[PDB]
Amino acid sequence: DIISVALKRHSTKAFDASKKLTPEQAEQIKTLLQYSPSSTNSQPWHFIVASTEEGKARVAKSAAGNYVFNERKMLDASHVVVFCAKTAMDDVWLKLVVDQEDADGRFATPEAKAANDKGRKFFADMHRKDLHDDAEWMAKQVYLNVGNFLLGVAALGLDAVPIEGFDAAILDAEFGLKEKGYTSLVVVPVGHHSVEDFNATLPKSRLPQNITLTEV
Amino acid sequence: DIISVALKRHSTKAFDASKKLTPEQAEQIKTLLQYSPSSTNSQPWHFIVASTEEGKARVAKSAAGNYVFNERKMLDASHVVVFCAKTAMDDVWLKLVVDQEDADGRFATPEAKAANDKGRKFFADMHRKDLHDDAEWMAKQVYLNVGNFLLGVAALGLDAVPIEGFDAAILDAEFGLKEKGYTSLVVVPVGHHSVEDFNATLPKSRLPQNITLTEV
Ligand SMILES: Cc1cc2nc3c(=O)[nH]c(=O)nc-3n(C[C@H](O)[C@H](O)[C@H](O)COP(=O)(O)O)c2cc1C
Ligand SMILES: Cc1cc2nc3c(=O)[nH]c(=O)nc-3n(C[C@H](O)[C@H](O)[C@H](O)COP(=O)(O)O)c2cc1C
Ligand SMILES: O=C(O)c1cccnc1
Ligand SMILES: O=C(O)c1cccnc1
């Protein structure tokens, strides 16, 4: 059951570089990235999946400075996902989303379709025009993607670790993300843990629900 | 197989008000909230789980203005989770986290424990002192929790819908969150869809991977 998975998964601190995702698992992790929900189906994200040694090493350059303890996880894991958010929400993206909803069969009439576009545009506008927080808003959708992904990959039997400990300016410049409209937020190596993963035998710790949760 | 679950789950547009979570499901969804990961195990969140008619109706007041289309979901569903983030990261919370890590058996020595505290404080300080983005940082952790939650409850066989379409200032004041150090971010009704959920028979739509995903 999924609760066992939630209780047994852990942040892997070191990966076995000789254990690769199966071809089928490599497909499945891309499916998880794609099929996450997002506010208005805005999907304001891009993913880089590095599985070559070259491409992981490029991503690993971002694990410099204070963040070297993360470098080896990025090099040793089978696949390394970089989760990136759009830096602004443009009308071309909003059109592409609704056209795709349309191509996929979600609208019965042109009017249903126009209403969807109008509603997405309205709610998007509150972030990009009124509140000026559309960067933050899109980044949140991407973290939601991450949350989905980590539970997903745990349920496939894979090890993983989310990493904020890396230099986004480096990683952005390494892949040309600013000029393309994106910024890197979280890196998630996926694979199988090695013997150096001290975190695999430690008990899980969370605050008690009497602190964090209220029922009404 | 979690990939099926990811491909079959949907944002429920209408719930059967007669169909309740089993008492066991009610406990399991609290377990998912608690055991989400977060950066440094900071767990910078609070949840309100409404199960009673009174409690749900309090939450549903936030579905005012042009967010009325969400009101029914909040009233008809069995359980309604309000995801809240801390509004600031204080040293009392950081201490509580590490003491809990300690009580749960994650430190071999007092020195291991002090090192953990030091590392959490260092990385937290980067957000609350250098970048002044600690609110955003914590809110991200909360969205991650959401993403975990949505996949988790779908794997328990429950229907749900994440909701940003509600008025957070109302919901905050309804539960006294500002003064307690919290702000509401996302609301997630959980239960079982009614036959009025038009979204249960619509195909899922996502942008294709040739736009959103790059392999290297
Ligand atoms: C957004 C995010 C960023 C994280 N960044 C790092 C990281 O840079 N390095 C690391 O070793 N762990 C990192 N973690 C792992 C957390 O410390 C871990 O999730 C938390 O301590 C709970 O343990 P668990 O993930 O084993 O349940 C991160 C977690 C998340 C959610
Ligand atoms: C953070 C968040 C906010 C959302 N807010 C609402 C909302 O207010 N009302 C609603 O009906 N759907 C809401 N949705 C549902 C999305 O529109 C839906 O996820 C998206 O269209 C993808 O369809 P799916 O969830 O069925 O896969 C929200 C989704 C997320 C992730
Ligand atoms: O996804 C949606 O339909 C949505 C998101 C936020 C607010 N209103 C609608
Ligand atoms: O969770 C961690 O251990 C973590 C998070 C950010 C940066 N370094 C470590």
From Swiss-Prot, chains A, B:
Pfam families: Nitroreductase. One of its GO terms (cellular component) is cytosol. Subject to competitive inhibition by dicoumarol, nicotinic acid and acetate with respect to NADH. Subject to uncompetitive inhibition by dicoumarol, nicotinic acid and acetate with respect to nitrofurazone and nitrofurantoin. GO terms for molecular function: 6,7-dihydropteridine reductase activity; FMN binding; identical protein binding; NAD(P)H dehydrogenase (quinone) activity; oxidoreductase activity; protein homodimerization activity. NAD(+) binds at residues 13, 40, 70, 73, 106. FMN binds at residues 9-13, 70, 164-165, 204-206. Keywords: Flavoprotein, FMN, NAD, NADP, Oxidoreductase. Homodimer. This is Oxygen-insensitive NAD(P)H nitroreductase. The lineage of its organism: Bacteria, Pseudomonadati, Pseudomonadota, Gammaproteobacteria, Enterobacterales. The gene is nfsB.
